């Protein structure tokens, strides 16, 4: 009784008010901060009413009803804040669904440039709780699918970094460091959770259960199948609740799962010892990031149970899901060197071969050669990674980003230029993150993280579809997304982009830029001129790009006031369309 009191008691008031603030920020991303704080105060005082007496006049309602009622106190400002008045006009489940379906992955929110370190330490120590609520509210409204318990862990490290380095000699050499690494890990955190929610919402929980079986058997190889199955069921419920807006239930169940894992370490893995001593948030984060355990040495081959046995078709028919779940578990525990998407491709190939061979006349002869169908599927990513990494170690991260940017702009010239720039930069970053790994586990690092970056290209393009190839590659099937995009070639059906009045913008504000903003500006110009000529652009885009670099260096080192950028910009647009 009184579900809201049950959540308040299990989570504690501090984690309660933080998770509710994250939920409000993720549902109304354009609502101001103070309105969210007022409604958070209201429902937590109401939750105190309910744990005081679980028979009070409104404590039996559902969390969605309570949060949706409090959210629609402000959510239909008829001026123009009425685009989500859709849901406030609905009720029951329809309104929550409407709320979920209105989450914006690329909102029009302004760039959060935050002030000098002294102003931050001042606003921090003036009121720590409002400073940290502001951090939560901003990250949650700009990342509406952010893993909520992980966000609590990020906020905890955020406040610890501020308490530490605001009482130092130089507040810059201590704070901005950890702030930037927190920001990088935050965007990696939310992109990974974005893939999880997209897989759940667009492919059902069967796809996530299979993905979880593969990943958990990779990491917990000494665990028995029933143990992995139990962990997979609980992990799928945690991420299902959380991707669907049930953040309090997401967090409470995640804590219960961390408690169960750390109570049964001896039947799961040998590498949970030091993570299982940490506090709640640190414990769950460490469990979710632990390295793969040592696999059992004398593991039998799998042909005896899945290829050579005469009960293959009978086991595939009487208990289909258990049989192939056991197959994926037995194949994933033996191959930590394979990526998860590859292991799911092999599992689906095994299932399809079993489908067509169990209907034939000599099934054993038919499915005895199923392990050969896996050779091309294993060879393709290994080649892709070795060639792209030996190209990366030649070019370096920045030029590797430019190479992937030209490649994918040739593949899908219709996709928005900013999204193209961001996805290719995040595509290039997998070279620095994984190519440096030993090839021992070079594939799971790269392809799985590629599945993350490409998923962002899906959800950013999903909201404004313009390329049918992106739509096909992202909707046909999850585990095949990387080959679909990899096998694409130049779009010969795309009519190029003529030089337009604002194809690019060059004022004096390009020299005073940081090193990343200037890379993004040049990469944006590179996207635009590849869109101007997708073919016949061998790699003499180098010629136009070096001419462009000579242009901005010249008109910057001049006595001008970007007057040079004006009529030497008309000279650039002339000399570039000729090439």
From Swiss-Prot:
Residues modified as Phosphoserine: 2, 55, 62, 270, 416, 486
UniProt site (Aspirin-acetylated lysine): 196
UniProt name for this protein: Albumin
Domain of life: Eukaryota
Disease (UniProt): Hyperthyroxinemia, familial dysalbuminemic: A disorder characterized by abnormally elevated levels of total serum thyroxine (T4) in euthyroid patients. It is due to abnormal serum albumin that binds T4 with enhanced affinity.
Record annotation: effect of changing residue 362 to V: In Iowa city-1
Site (described: Not glycated): 1, 17, 38, 61, 70, 90, 103, 133, 156, 171, 178, 187, 192, 202, 209, 237, 259, 271, 283, 356, 369, 386, 399, 411, 429, 433, 463, 472, 497, 516, 521, 535, 538, 554, 557, 561, 571
């Amino acid at each position: 009784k009184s579900e809201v009191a049950h959540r308040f008691k299990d989570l504690g008031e501090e984690n309660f008010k933080a998770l509710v603030l994250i939920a409000f920020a993720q549902y109304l991303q354009q609502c101001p901060f103070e309105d969210h704080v007022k409604l958070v105060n209201e429902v937590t005082e109401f939750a105190k009413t309910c744990v005081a007496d679980e028979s009070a006049e409104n404590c039996d309602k559902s969390l969605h009803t309570l949060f949706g009622d409090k959210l629609c106190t402000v959510a239909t400002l008829r001026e123009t804040y009425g685009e989500m008045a859709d849901c406030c006009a609905k009720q029951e489940p329809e309104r929550n669904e409407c709320f979920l379906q209105h989450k914006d992955d690329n909102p029009n929110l302004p760039r959060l440039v935050r002030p000098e370190v002294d102003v931050m330490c001042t606003a921090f120590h003036d009121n720590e709780e409002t400073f940290l609520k502001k951090y939560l509210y901003e990250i949650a409204r700009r990342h509406p699918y952010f893993y909520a318990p992980e966000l609590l862990f990020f906020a905890k490290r955020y406040k610890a970094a501020f308490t530490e380095c605001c009482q130092a000699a130089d507040k810059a050499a201590c704070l901005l460091p950890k702030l930037d690494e927190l920001r990088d890990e935050g965007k990696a955190s939310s992109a990974k959770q974005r893939l999880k929610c997209a897989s759940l919402q667009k492919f059902g929980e069967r796809a996530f259960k299979a993905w979880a079986v593969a990943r958990l058997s990779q990491r917990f190889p000494k665990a028995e199948f029933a143990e992995v199955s139990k962990l997979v069921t609980d992990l799928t419920k945690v991420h299902t609740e959380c991707c669907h807006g049930d953040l309090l239930e997401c967090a409470d169940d995640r804590a219960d799962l961390a408690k169960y894992i750390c109570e049964n370490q001896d039947s799961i893995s040998s590498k949970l010892k030091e993570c299982c001593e940490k506090p709640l948030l640190e414990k769950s984060h460490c469990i979710a990031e632990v390295e793969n355990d040592e696999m059992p040495a004398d593991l039998p081959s799998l042909a005896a149970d899945f290829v050579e046995s005469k009960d293959v078709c009978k086991n595939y028919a009487e208990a289909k899901d258990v049989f192939l779940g056991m197959f994926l578990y037995e194949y994933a525990r033996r191959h930590p060197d394979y990526s998860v998407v590859l292991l799911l491709r092999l599992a689906k190939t095994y299932e399809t071969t079993l489908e067509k061979c169990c209907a034939a006349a000599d099934p054993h002869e038919c499915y005895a050669k199923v392990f050969d169908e896996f050779k091309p599927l294993v060879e393709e990513p290994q080649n892709l990674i070795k060639q792209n990494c030996e190209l990366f170690e030649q070019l370096g991260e920045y030029k590797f980003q430019n190479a992937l940017l030209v490649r994918y702009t040739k593949k899908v010239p219709q996709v928005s230029t900013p999204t193209l720039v961001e996805v290719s930069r995040n595509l290039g970053k997998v070279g620095s993150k994984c190519c440096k790994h030993p090839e021992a586990k070079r594939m799971p690092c790269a392809e799985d993280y590629l599945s993350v970056v490409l998923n962002q290209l899906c959800v950013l393009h999903e909201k404004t579809p313009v390329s049918d190839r992106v739509t096909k590659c992202c909707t046909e099937s999850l585990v095949n997304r990387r080959p679909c995009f990899s096998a694409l070639e130049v779009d010969e059906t795309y009519v190029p982009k003529e030089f337009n009045a604002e194809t690019f913008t060059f004022h004096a504000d390009i020299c005073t830029l940081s090193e990343k903003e200037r890379q993004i500006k040049k990469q944006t110009a590179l996207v635009e001129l590849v869109k101007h000529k997708p073919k016949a652009t061998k790699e003499q885009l180098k010629a136009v790009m070096d001419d462009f670099a000579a242009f901005v260096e010249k008109c910057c080192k001049a006595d001008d006031k970007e007057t040079c950028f004006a009529e030497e910009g008309k000279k650039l647009v002339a000399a570039s369309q000729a090439a």
